[PDB]
Amino acid sequence: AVSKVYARSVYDSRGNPTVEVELTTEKGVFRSIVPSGASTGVHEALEMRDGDKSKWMGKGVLHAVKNVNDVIAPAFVKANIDVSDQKAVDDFLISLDGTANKSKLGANAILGVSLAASRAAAAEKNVPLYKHLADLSKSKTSPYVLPVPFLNVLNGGSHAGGALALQEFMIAPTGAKTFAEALRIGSEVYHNLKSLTKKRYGASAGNVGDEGGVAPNIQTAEEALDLIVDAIKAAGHDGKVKIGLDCASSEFFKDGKYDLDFKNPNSDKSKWLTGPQLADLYHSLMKRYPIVSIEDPFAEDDWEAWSHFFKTAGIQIVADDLTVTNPKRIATAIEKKAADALLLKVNQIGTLSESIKAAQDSFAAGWGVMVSHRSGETEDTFIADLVVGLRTGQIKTGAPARSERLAKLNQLLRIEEELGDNAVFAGENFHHGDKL
Amino acid sequence: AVSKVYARSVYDSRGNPTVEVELTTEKGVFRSIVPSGASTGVHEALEMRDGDKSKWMGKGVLHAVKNVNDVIAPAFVKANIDVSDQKAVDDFLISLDGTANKSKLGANAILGVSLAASRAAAAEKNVPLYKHLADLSKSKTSPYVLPVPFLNVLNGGSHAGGALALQEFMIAPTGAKTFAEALRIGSEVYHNLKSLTKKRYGASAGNVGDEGGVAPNIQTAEEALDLIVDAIKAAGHDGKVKIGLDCASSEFFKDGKYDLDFKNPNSDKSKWLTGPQLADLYHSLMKRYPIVSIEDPFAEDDWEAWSHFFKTAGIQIVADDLTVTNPKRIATAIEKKAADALLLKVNQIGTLSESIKAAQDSFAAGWGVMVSHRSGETEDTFIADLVVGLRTGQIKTGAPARSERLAKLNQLLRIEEELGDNAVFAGENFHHGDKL
Numbered sequence: 001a002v003s004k005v006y007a008r009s010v011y012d013s014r015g016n017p018t019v020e021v022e023l024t025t026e027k028g029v030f031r032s033i034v035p036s037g038a039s040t041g042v043h044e045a046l047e048m049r050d051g052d053k054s055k056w057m058g059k060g061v062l063h064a065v066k067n068v069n070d071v072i073a074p075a076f077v078k079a080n081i082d083v084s085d086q087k088a089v090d091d092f093l094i095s096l097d098g099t100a101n102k103s104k105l106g107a108n109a110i111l112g113v114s115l116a117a118s119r120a121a122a123a124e125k126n127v128p129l130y131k132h133l134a135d136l137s138k139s140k141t142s143p144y145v146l147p148v149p150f151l152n153v154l155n156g157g158s159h160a161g162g163a164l165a166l167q168e169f170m171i172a173p174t175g176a177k178t179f180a181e182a183l184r185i186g187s188e189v190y191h192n193l194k195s196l197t198k199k200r201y202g203a204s205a206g207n208v209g210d211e212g213g214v215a216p217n218i219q220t221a222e223e224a225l226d227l228i229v230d231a232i233k234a235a236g237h238d239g240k241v242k243i244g245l246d247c248a249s250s251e252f253f254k255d256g257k258y259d260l261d262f263k264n265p266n267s268d269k270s271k272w273l274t275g276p277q278l279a280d281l282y283h284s285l286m287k288r289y290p291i292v293s294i295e296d297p298f299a300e301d302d303w304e305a306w307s308h309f310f311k312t313a314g315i316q317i318v319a320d321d322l323t324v325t326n327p328k329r330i331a332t333a334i335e336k337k338a339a340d341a342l343l344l345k346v347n348q349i350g351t352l353s354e355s356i357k358a359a360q361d362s363f364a365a366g367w368g369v370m371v372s373h374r375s376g377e378t379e380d381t382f383i384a385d386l387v388v389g390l391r392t393g394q395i396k397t398g399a400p401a402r403s404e405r406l407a408k409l410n411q412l413l414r415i416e417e418e419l420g421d422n423a424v425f426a427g428e429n430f431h432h433g434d435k436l
Numbered sequence: 437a438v439s440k441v442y443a444r445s446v447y448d449s450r451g452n453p454t455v456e457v458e459l460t461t462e463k464g465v466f467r468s469i470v471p472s473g474a475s476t477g478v479h480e481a482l483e484m485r486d487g488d489k490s491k492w493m494g495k496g497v498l499h500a501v502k503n504v505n506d507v508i509a510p511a512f513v514k515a516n517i518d519v520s521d522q523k524a525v526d527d528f529l530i531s532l533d534g535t536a537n538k539s540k541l542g543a544n545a546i547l548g549v550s551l552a553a554s555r556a557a558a559a560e561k562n563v564p565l566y567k568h569l570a571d572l573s574k575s576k577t578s579p580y581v582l583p584v585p586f587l588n589v590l591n592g593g594s595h596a597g598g599a600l601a602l603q604e605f606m607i608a609p610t611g612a613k614t615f616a617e618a619l620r621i622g623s624e625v626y627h628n629l630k631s632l633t634k635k636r637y638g639a640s641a642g643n644v645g646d647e648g649g650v651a652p653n654i655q656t657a658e659e660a661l662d663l664i665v666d667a668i669k670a671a672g673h674d675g676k677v678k679i680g681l682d683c684a685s686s687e688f689f690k691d692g693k694y695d696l697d698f699k700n701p702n703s704d705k706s707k708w709l710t711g712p713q714l715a716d717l718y719h720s721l722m723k724r725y726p727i728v729s730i731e732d733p734f735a736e737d738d739w740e741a742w743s744h745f746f747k748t749a750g751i752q753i754v755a756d757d758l759t760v761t762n763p764k765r766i767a768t769a770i771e772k773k774a775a776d777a778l779l780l781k782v783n784q785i786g787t788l789s790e791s792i793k794a795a796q797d798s799f800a801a802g803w804g805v806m807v808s809h810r811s812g813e814t815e816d817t818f819i820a821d822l823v824v825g826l827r828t829g830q831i832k833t834g835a836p837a838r839s840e841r842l843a844k845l846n847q848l849l850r851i852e853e854e855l856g857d858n859a860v861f862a863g864e865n866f867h868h869g870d871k872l
């Protein structure tokens with residue numbers, strides 16, 4: 001029995017408020033903290049902020065906080081919902097909001113409750129959260145799969161600049177034999193990266209992104225990937241480490257074109273590329289560097305450049321803003337053969353049921369699932385349990401810098417260790433972690 | 437009854453290994469994560485790392501990990517120590533090491549056990565950790581004092597450069613009426629700072645330090661404090677926000693002189709200052725900006741420049757590297773009247789007893805106590821409970837950016853809220869938080 005449902009305002013990795021939910025049951029108080037993901041992806045559950053500019057820069061979540069405390073708690077207590085029954089919990093949460101995008105009560109007020117409920121159902125079940133999630137998702141747990149961590153080491157996009165349009169440059173210790181080893185290789189390479197970085201670009205090139213990657217003032221992607229390959233090498237792990245890219249291409253999408261040199265605005269145009277021309281630039285990079293994954297290569301409604309590139313990619317194509325974790329958007333992506341992997345971001349749909357539900361359909365179309373963090377993270381380790389229970393084989397939780405990030409990586413350290421022989425590391429099979 | 441004492445390797449905010457201890461009792465498993473503080477302070481408990489350069493860059497703690505697992509656990513289980521009895525726990529931990537500086541077993545292997553024990557004693561006591569700590573420290577708890585957070589917003593020292601020698605520039609929302617309000621004011625000012633920063637110095641000036649402060653490439657301290665005062669103003673909180681400085685002066689101490697322009701090395705000398713000349717520069721800054729605290733103004737064995745400045749300071753003088761949390765070093769500092777506040781860093785002495793014990797003597801000499809984090813933090817919130825239980829009135833846990841940091845700030849959010857009317861916020865009385 002759920003006896004109390006409460007919420008408070010706390011801070012995220014960026015110093016911006018967010019919602020914290022506490023759920024009391026006969027077994028104790030369960031907490032959840034929602035991520036404040038830089039919002040980007042038309043067609044996602046809406047975020048609810050005060051907009052009061054004289055407070056938190058207008059990013060308070062005092063409403064959302066209210067939505068929980070004054071609206072949801074009362075009704076939820078009353079409902080006497082068996083927390084074990086996750087669909088039941090989310091159906092009830094969605095029923096109260098009544099909008100398709102959670103804009104009445106707001107996706108931050110609903111997630112919190114939805115994530116706390118699952119923790120309270122694990123305690124009651126007397127199982128570790130990953131196990132509960134395996135059970136809600138009807139995933140194989142014989143053995144459990146630990147995933148490769150896609151670590152953001154070098155940031156672009158949002159963080160600084162030259163023309164380097166590209167957003168995230170990830171390393172994936174695919175060659176590791178354990179999660180624990182993948183993280184060490186990961187870390188070793190990362191430190192290398194910083195030194196190489198500080199030497200070439202200045203001590204300043206060294207301070208980090210929102211996610212922990214160094215944010216050197218670079219021009220081109222080549223120059224970025226050259227920098228990373230030197231760190232792999234230097235770290236002594238050539239061959240064990242692969243690269244992943246997050247183009248976050250909606251970002252430089254203009255006039256049906258793509259601007260690989262933004263940050264002028266002497267918006268140099270004739271250089272601007274078309275779906276197909278970009279496709280060629282990607283293919284270029286593909287052969288020159290050990291890239292095994294590409295997220296958002298084309299813009300979010302640029303259905304034809306996706307479909308077209310996908311035909312000849314030959315590597316994992318991750319859909320993040322094209323699908324915004326919306327099964328409606330997934331189904332189309334699936335029928336258009338736009339990609340073959342889904343960036344699962346829970347606060348994009350706003351409910352745990354809905355999140356599992358979207359991974360389940362991705363997995364049934366033979367897609368992979370990269371579980372993901374938001375730009376604005378917390379100390380909450382929910383996504384560590386989540387990639388394991390879903391058995392995806394891959395997670396993107398940032399660089400091995402900032403505890404909003406190590407927090408999840410440390411958590412997998414703990415899960416792996418606890419699983420003993422019952423866990424196998426995804427490695428080279430990260431993409432179909434689930435079929436493993 | 438302590439039934440098992442185990443340890444594993446996990447990561448810190450910097451991606452460098454550190455020790456994690458798990459203590460099993462009849463009430464459950466208690467955990468502690470030790471901070472990897474950039475070591476600086478001759479005369480502190482020694483840090484224990486593998487030094488194996490082919491692993492973790494030679495920063496493994498696999499030994500330390502071993503010291504716990506193979507040496508300490510066995511003996512500790514056997515000892516059948518009442519965890520309630522903290523001195524007893526630490527006496528036993530120190531007895532096994534037998535060095536004054538914890539160099540046999542290493543201060544990281546001993547801290548972990550010492551911090552887990554206290555959490556296991558709270559659970560058993562059935563009180564919240566801050567309360568247990570109040571009890572171990574024999575501190576007033578009527579009411580409890582929430583402290584002002586000294587938030588690192590702008591970093592120098594270790595992070596980048598011009599000549600700006602100074603290390604940390606802190607903001608202290610002294611004028612707030614609640615902790616919850618101090619953090620908001622704090623955060624509001626911080627975001628302001630970033631924008632001002634990005635505008636004047638480039639998008640790059642915007643990425644952050646190890647602690648979360650922006651790390652603009654600045655020259656002088658004036659230019660740094662000018663930048664901060666504009667953010668206070670701009671944020672609309674002039675008068676409520678005060679400044680704290682961490683000169684970390686050991687850093688530019690050379691030939692009995694201080695180099696305020698390091699980063700040449702066309703070690704420009706005739707400009708180099710003497711204790712007294714620096715004292716004058718500080719006094720300058722003191723009148724020009726709302727500075728209410730200064731940490732490490734003079735070098736760690738530069739006893740005479742401290743004593744001398746202290747005479748006419750008229751603000752809080754924090755001893756960090758001069759005292760390295762060593763009561764032996766404190767007593768001297770006290771008899772020499774070098775400072776009037778102690779930076780308590782637990783992994784500097786290596787035991788909880790020893791830490792409380794040093795605050796107790798600082799407090800008896802009429803000093804204040806600023807509880808502190810390390811450069812290399814974790815998701816562990818131990819220091820939040822610790823500043824409250826000690827009733828210091830002040831804590832330095834970084835900027836309101838990075839969860840190794842918000843993690844402790846969120847925790848105080850929670851404690852304040854739980855204490856209800858039983859907690860008063862230190863405010864303007866942060867320095868003698870304890871007499872309050």
Ligand SMILES: O=C(O)[C@@H](CO)OP(=O)(O)O
Binds near residue numbers: 374
């Ligand atoms: O974690 C993510 O993948 C990033 C973008 O890919 O999140 P945000 O959208 O908040 O920047």
Ligand SMILES: O=C(O)[C@@H](CO)OP(=O)(O)O
Binds near residue numbers: 472475684779811
């Ligand atoms: O937290 C601290 O005060 C800093 C220095 O003052 O720690 P470190 O010594 O690790 O840099």
Ligand SMILES: [Mg+2]
Binds near residue numbers: 248295296320321
């Ligand atoms: Mg993306």
Ligand SMILES: [Mg+2]
Binds near residue numbers: 682684731732757779
């Ligand atoms: Mg210091």
